Write an enzyme that holds these catalytic residues in place. Sequence first.
Site, PDB file in Angstrom:
ATOM      1  CD  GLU A 124      -3.031   1.153   2.294  1.00  0.00           C
ATOM      2  OE1 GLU A 124      -2.757   0.446   3.062  1.00  0.00           O
ATOM      3  OE2 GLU A 124      -3.987   1.946   2.098  1.00  0.00           O
ATOM      4  CD  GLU A 268      -4.869  -1.859   5.776  1.00  0.00           C
ATOM      5  OE1 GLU A 268      -3.794  -1.501   6.420  1.00  0.00           O
ATOM      6  OE2 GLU A 268      -5.758  -1.286   4.801  1.00  0.00           O
ATOM      7  CG  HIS A 301      -5.432   1.108  12.513  1.00  0.00           C
ATOM      8  ND1 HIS A 301      -6.295   2.333  12.687  1.00  0.00           N
ATOM      9  CD2 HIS A 301      -5.169   0.872  11.282  1.00  0.00           C
ATOM     10  CE1 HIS A 301      -6.202   2.741  11.277  1.00  0.00           C
ATOM     11  NE2 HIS A 301      -5.630   1.842  10.405  1.00  0.00           N
ATOM     12  CD  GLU A 302      -2.626  -1.901  10.918  1.00  0.00           C
ATOM     13  OE1 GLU A 302      -3.098  -1.954   9.726  1.00  0.00           O
ATOM     14  OE2 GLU A 302      -1.967  -0.739  11.154  1.00  0.00           O
ATOM     15  CD  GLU A 324      -6.404   3.387   6.357  1.00  0.00           C
ATOM     16  OE1 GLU A 324      -6.133   3.399   7.888  1.00  0.00           O
ATOM     17  OE2 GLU A 324      -5.889   2.624   5.807  1.00  0.00           O
TER      18      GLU A 324
HETATM   19  C1  LIG Z   1       0.318   5.093  12.494  1.00  0.00           C
HETATM   20  C2  LIG Z   1      -1.006   4.961  11.402  1.00  0.00           C
HETATM   21  C3  LIG Z   1      -1.421   6.221  10.921  1.00  0.00           C
HETATM   22  C4  LIG Z   1      -2.187   4.570  12.277  1.00  0.00           C
HETATM   23  C5  LIG Z   1      -0.499   4.129  10.570  1.00  0.00           C
HETATM   24  O1  LIG Z   1       0.172   2.879  10.655  1.00  0.00           O
HETATM   25  N1  LIG Z   1      -1.338   3.720   9.247  1.00  0.00           N
HETATM   26  C6  LIG Z   1      -1.019   2.882   8.410  1.00  0.00           C
HETATM   27  C7  LIG Z   1      -2.485   2.176   8.196  1.00  0.00           C
HETATM   28  O2  LIG Z   1      -3.524   2.735   7.618  1.00  0.00           O
HETATM   29  N2  LIG Z   1      -2.494   0.486   8.842  1.00  0.00           N
HETATM   30  O3  LIG Z   1      -3.647   0.277   8.375  1.00  0.00           O
HETATM   31  C8  LIG Z   1      -0.625   3.344   7.094  1.00  0.00           C
HETATM   32  C9  LIG Z   1      -0.565   2.394   5.849  1.00  0.00           C
HETATM   33  C10 LIG Z   1      -0.054   2.817   4.618  1.00  0.00           C
HETATM   34  C11 LIG Z   1       0.447   3.769   4.690  1.00  0.00           C
HETATM   35 BR1  LIG Z   1       0.941   4.550   2.806  1.00  0.00          BR
HETATM   36  C12 LIG Z   1       0.207   4.819   5.694  1.00  0.00           C
HETATM   37  C13 LIG Z   1      -0.016   4.841   6.702  1.00  0.00           C
HETATM   38 ZN   LIG Z   2      -5.156   1.592   8.563  1.00  0.00          ZN
END
Ligand SMILES: CC(C)(C)C(=O)N[C@@H](C(=O)NO)c1ccc(Br)cc1
Ligand SMILES: [Zn+2]
Length: 889
Positions: A124, A268, A301-302, A324
Site C-alpha cells: 500500500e 493490514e 487498528h489493523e 482509514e
Molecule cells: C500510525 C498509523 C497512521 C495508524 C498507521 O500505521 N497507518 C497505516 C495504516 O493505515 N495501517 O492500516 C498506514 C498504512 C499505509 C500507509 Br501508505 C500509511 C499509513
Molecule cells: Zn489503516
Amino acid sequence: PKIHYRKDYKPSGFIINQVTLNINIHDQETIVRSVLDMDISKHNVGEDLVFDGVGLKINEISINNKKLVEGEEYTYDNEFLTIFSKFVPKSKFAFSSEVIIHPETNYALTGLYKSKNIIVSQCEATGFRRITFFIDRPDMMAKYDVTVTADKEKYPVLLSNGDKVNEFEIPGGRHGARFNDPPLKPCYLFAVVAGDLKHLSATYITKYTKKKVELYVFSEEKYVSKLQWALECLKKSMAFDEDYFGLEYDLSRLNLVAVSDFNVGAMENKGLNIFNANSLLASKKNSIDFSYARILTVVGHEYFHQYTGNRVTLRDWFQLTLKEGLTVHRENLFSEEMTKTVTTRLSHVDLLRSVQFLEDSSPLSHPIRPESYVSMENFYTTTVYDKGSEVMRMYLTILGEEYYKKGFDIYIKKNDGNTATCEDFNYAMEQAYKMKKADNSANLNQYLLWFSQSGTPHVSFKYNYDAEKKQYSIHVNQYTKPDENQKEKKPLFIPISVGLINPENGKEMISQTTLELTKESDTFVFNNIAVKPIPSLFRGFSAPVYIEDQLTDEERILLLKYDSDAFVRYNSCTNIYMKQILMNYNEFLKAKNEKLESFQLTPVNAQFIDAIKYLLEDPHADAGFKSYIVSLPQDRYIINFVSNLDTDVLADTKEYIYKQIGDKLNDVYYKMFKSLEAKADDLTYFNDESHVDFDQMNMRTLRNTLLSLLSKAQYPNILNEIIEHSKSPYPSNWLTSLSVSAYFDKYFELYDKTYKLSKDDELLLQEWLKTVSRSDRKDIYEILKKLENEVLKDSKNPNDIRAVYLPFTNNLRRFHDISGKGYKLIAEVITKTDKFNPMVATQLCEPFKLWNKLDTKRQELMLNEMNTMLQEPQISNNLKEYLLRLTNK
Ligand SMILES: CC(C)(C)C(=O)N[C@@H](C(=O)NO)c1ccc(Br)cc1
Ligand SMILES: [Zn+2]
Ligand SMILES: [Mg+2]
Ligand SMILES: [Mg+2]
C-alpha cells in the site's frame, strides 16, 4: 507530474483473475516470476495493455507462452510497461514475466525490501508494482497463488497470504513454501515475509460460529519476549468487534510480524499484518508507558481493517478515508472501551485540534476525500485519518448506538466482498437515519459535504434567558473560511451534544440532547428552565470544529469544576488558557514592537488557579485529567489563533503563565508528586506482561508532568527527587529524569546513565534519542551533533532518523532560532533522507507546515529552505509535490 482526478474514475479495460507468483530470494538478487490469468473487460476500447512496473529488471515477458520482443511489441520506461494492442488478445489470455529486484538495497521500504535480517513487503499504496508488473489499483481484484523460495539457514520462516499448502526442500540448502489465497483481493493487500522469526501463539474461538483461529505474533529472536502484550491486544480486538459490531474473524489464522525498518505504524495485509517494531513490541523493563497504548491501538487498528478495508475494500484511492477514517473510529471505540479512562478520548481531540487543525488551515488543506493527487502516499494524512474518524464518529452521535449498529450492519452486509465508495457508507447510515426519524423522507445528502469540503468550521454562540417565562435560548452559527478548494463554503450538518448545568448546585437541568445544526444559523429554545444555566456545549467533542463558547471565565471555571462531561471541562480549561495566552502575547508583543522600558502584564485569573488547586487535591478526581489541566495547550493548537506568530514572544508568554501558576501551586505540586509515588510506581505486576493498568500509567504521567513543572521552577532541592527518579525501574520515569535534569548540571551525568540503560534495546534507545532530542537545553544544537556522530551516524532506519530530529522540531525557542539554523538543519536532513526514502523525507517536512503563520522574518527563512529543497535536481516526486503544495505553487 501526472495528476490524477477523482472525477476521472473509470473501470479498467482489462481484468486480472488469477495471480501465480514465484518469489526466488537469493543473496544478491530476488527473481520474481509471475503468471497473470487475464481477460478483456466490457469497458475495453482496444487500447494498449499498460502495466505498472517500477524499477523492474526485465529478463523476459510473454503472452500465452510466447516471448515478446522489445520495441516492436512493447516498451518499458522503468515505470510503465506498454504492450501495443495489436499484440494483445481479445479473449482470455495469460501474461507472464520474469523480473529481478533487489530488496537488499531497497531503502525506500516500499515493495519488497530487507529489514535487518528479514525480507518483508509493503504494497500500500503503490508498492506491488515494485515487485512485479500489475494494473496496480485497488479495483483490480484477483486470486493469489504464491510460492516463496529462499536459503533455509537464513530464512526458515516463510509467510504469505492464505493457507500454506505445501512445504518442500530445494537442492543447495534452500526450501520453498506455497500459499494459496482463493478469496479475491486488491494487490496492495498482498504480503510476503521471510526470516529467522520466533513466535508466540494462541488459539481464539469465535463467539458465534465457534471457529478456531490460530493467532501468531512474530519478531526476531532477540525480542521474542516483547510479543506478549501484542497477543493480548489481538485477543481484545477480536472480542470487541464480536461484542460491539457482531463481527467474527473469517480465516483460520492471523499472523502479526514486527520489523525494525518501517515507514509507518503497521499494515493490514490479509492474514499477515506487518508492524513497525515500535508498534508491536514492548516489555515493562524496556518500554515507556506510551508503548502499551500505542500497541493496543495499532494492533486494534489493523485487525478492524479486516472488515473495514479488506472484506469491504476501496473502489479507488480517493475513497481512502472510507477504510482509514472508519477504522480509526473503530480503533477509538475499542481503545476507549479497553482503557476505561477519559484521557483516551481527550488525547485524540488534543491531537486533532493541534496537528489536524494546523493542516486544515495550511496550504496543504484538503477534504477527507481529496479531489486530486500526484503521489497518493502524500494523502495518508491526519485529515484523512483523524478528521475522517471524527466524521465517522458523528454518525454514531447522530444516530445513537442502536441505530448506528444497524446502519453499520447494513453497510457490511450490502458491500461485503465488494469495492465501495464514501457514498455507499453514507447511504447505509441514511437508511438508519430514516428508521430513527420514523419517516422515509429524511436524508443525509447534506452530510456528504463533510467528505468534500475542506477547512475547519467555526461555531459560535449567543445565549438569552427570560427568568419570568423560564425560557432559555441558544443561538448558534457556523462558518468555514474560504480556501483554495472551495470559493464558497456551505453550512454542514453539525451535531451539537449539549447539557445545561445549574450554576447553583452543578446539576444537570436537561436530559441528553444532540442539537442538529443544518443551517448557517439557528436558535434552539428550551422551556421549563428554572434558572439561567451554564451551557455544556459539544459534549465529547461532538463535531470537529472551532468552538467559540462565548462564556465568561467565571462560567468556564464552574464547568471545569462541576460539569459531567470530560471534554467540556477540558475545553473550558483550554479556553481560559487561550484567552490568557492571547492577552499576554499581545502585551509582550506591543512591548517588543514599541521597545518599551516598562509595561504591565495581565495576571492569570486567581479563581482559575484556585480551581486547579481544587481539582488537584480531589482524591476522587482522575490523575490523567489532572495532567491536562496543569498543562498549557499545545503550541500547534495556539498557532491557529495567532497571525504572524513571533515564537520568542509565545515562548515568553508561556513561561510567564506557567510561572504565575507555579508561584501559587508549586507546594501543591510537590506534595502530590510525593503522595502519588506509592500507587504510581507499584511494582506488583512489573513482571506480568499481560497486566496493564492505564490508571496507574496516568498517575505516572501526572507525576512526571508535575516533576517537569517543579524542575523548570527550580523548586528547592527538587534535584534530589530527580536523582531518585532516575533509579526507578520504569523507563517512563528514568527517561523523564533525564529530560527534567536539563535545567541542572547533572544533565550529562544522567545522559550517560540513561544511555547505558537504553543502548542494548533497539526500541528503548530510540526512546532515549527522542528524550535527548526534546531536552530543553541551551546547547541542544551541540547535543544533536553529538547524537549524529556517536549514535545515529549513517542509519537509514526511519525510527532512528525521526527520533533524533522530530522532537527537536517542537522546541519553540531553539528550533525557531532567528538565525534560521534550525530550519537549515532539518532541510538538510530532509534532502539527505529524500535520496533513499521519499516518504520519510516528507514526514520530516512537518515543521514547515506552519511556515506562513509565523512572523515575516521566520516566514522568509522557512520559505528559503523549502525553495532550496525544491531546487534539488534529484528531488523525489513525493517531496516535490508536497513542497509545491505547501508553498502554493
Ligand atoms: C500510525 C498509523 C497512521 C495508524 C498507521 O500505521 N497507518 C497505516 C495504516 O493505515 N495501517 O492500516 C498506514 C498504512 C499505509 C500507509 Br501508505 C500509511 C499509513
Ligand atoms: Zn489503516
Ligand atoms: Mg530495480
Ligand atoms: Mg538498528
